């Protein structure tokens, strides 16, 4: 298919945000490169939740000021999202920061019966990530590099 990087990225980010909001792992089969995407999801469960615990106050402080309740507000977040790159630095930390921000928003949407807004939220996040940093992601081997970046000694 056309633009496989975007499709895969949306698949990963969609399922993570929805799983974070509902607390239930998805079981619907994934598509091309889904095996790598499964490992990236598990990586996000570990790393993403670690970021959320250590910085929940900062993230909650943002939600308080944002006061988003509908689809329009969700899309309006793109202006905020791009600031993870504001200093000219790009790394998997900034991307995990952005996705973790999405997780806090997705959890909120759940609590006000806006699960339908999680899908356009994931599209907005994937837009900021892929539409502005595609060159960086390709050079970093995409989600396979993501998985290898967070490899734990175990």
């Amino acid at each position: 298919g056309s633009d496989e990087l975007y499709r895969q990225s949306l698949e990963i980010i969609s399922r993570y945000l929805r799983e974070q909001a509902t607390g239930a792992k998805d079981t619907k089969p994934m598509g091309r490169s889904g095996a790598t995407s499964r490992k990236a999801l598990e990586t996000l469960r570990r790393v993403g939740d670690g970021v959320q615990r250590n910085h929940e106050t900062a993230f909650q402080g943002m939600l308080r000021k944002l006061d988003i309740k509908n689809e329009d507000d969700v899309k309006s977040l793109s202006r905020v999202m791009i600031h993870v790159f504001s200093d000219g630095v790009t790394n998997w930390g900034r991307i995990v920061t952005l996705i973790s921000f999405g997780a806090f928003v997705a959890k909120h949407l759940k609590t006000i019966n806006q699960e339908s807004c999680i899908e356009p939220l994931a599209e907005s996040i994937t837009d900021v990530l892929v539409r502005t940093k595609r060159d960086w992601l390709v050079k970093q081997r995409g989600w396979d590099g993501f998985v290898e970046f967070f490899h734990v000694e175990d």
Binding site: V47, G50, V51, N54, H55, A58, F59, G61, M62, K65, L66, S76, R79, V80, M81, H83, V84, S86, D87, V89, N91, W92, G93, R94, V96, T97, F101, F150
Partner: peptide, 22 residues
């Protein structure tokens, strides 16, 4: 003085904190 602009700066600040971890 916009809340959205203020939040954007906080998001950058938070990202720089997270660089120290991952």
């Amino acid at each position: 003085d916009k809340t959205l602009e203020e939040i954007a700066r906080e998001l950058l600040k938070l990202a720089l904190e997270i660089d120290k971890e991952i």
